[PDB]
Amino acid sequence: EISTHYVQGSHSEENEALLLGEDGNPVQKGDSLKVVPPIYMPHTQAQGATKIYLSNRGKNIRKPLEGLASLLKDPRYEFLFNADDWSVNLDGKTNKDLD
Amino acid sequence: EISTHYVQGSHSEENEALLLGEDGNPVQKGDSLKVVPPIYMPHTQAQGATKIYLSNRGKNIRKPLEGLASLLKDPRYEFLFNADDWSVNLDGKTNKDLD
Numbered sequence A, B: 001e002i003s004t005h006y007v008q009g010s011h012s013e014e015n016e017a018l019l020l021g022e023d024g025n026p027v028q029k030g031d032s033l034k035v036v037p038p039i040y041m042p043h044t045q046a047q048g049a050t051k052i053y054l055s056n057r058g059k060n061i062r063k064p065l066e067g068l069a070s071l072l073k074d075p076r077y078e079f080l081f082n083a084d085d086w087s088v089n090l091d092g093k094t095n096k097d098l099d
Helices: A064-071 A073-082 B062-072 B073-080
Strands: none
Touching: A064 A073, B062 B073
16 A cells, blocks of 8 residues: 555556665565565656556555554553464464464 | 745756845745745746746645644744753754653
8 A cells, every 4th residue: 555566557566666775775675573664665757757656456444554553563462463372473373273 | 835846847855946036045045943934936837937837746735734833833832842941953852851
């Protein structure tokens, strides 16, 4: 819903128009275990610069996603989202089960 | 949202088309601590004179910004916006902290 495709018309994930640094690397690639969101190039399709059009697949649930992001970093929900032996990693694997 | 760019197509901040005075200096460059806004040249890119285009990046929040400015110039909200020692400078540095 935020990251913009490098080319208009198509919203491919591989065309993420992120904000790159002087060296060439993006300013903020983004993390999954951490809740930092990725940085993206500003949406602008005017003359002079490349045509940047925002993704058209985004829904209207930005506020609930922001609320969930705030909740994820709250240390009062460790028992829910960060269980010791029941923490689900990226690929969906748990150290122990419900037994 | 109100100032106009000196070059059409792009709205770079370095292309601000501020209405200059007879002597050469701008009539109203604007101030930050003071809530006075800068004056800009009229939006008219017709033939005969130089082409000046309006801002192409502004949102639709002119009314809330005017309300915020009115609140900022209100002496009844000093306890919020102009606290005694916890005033914030332009670079974001206060005399004291929350402790």
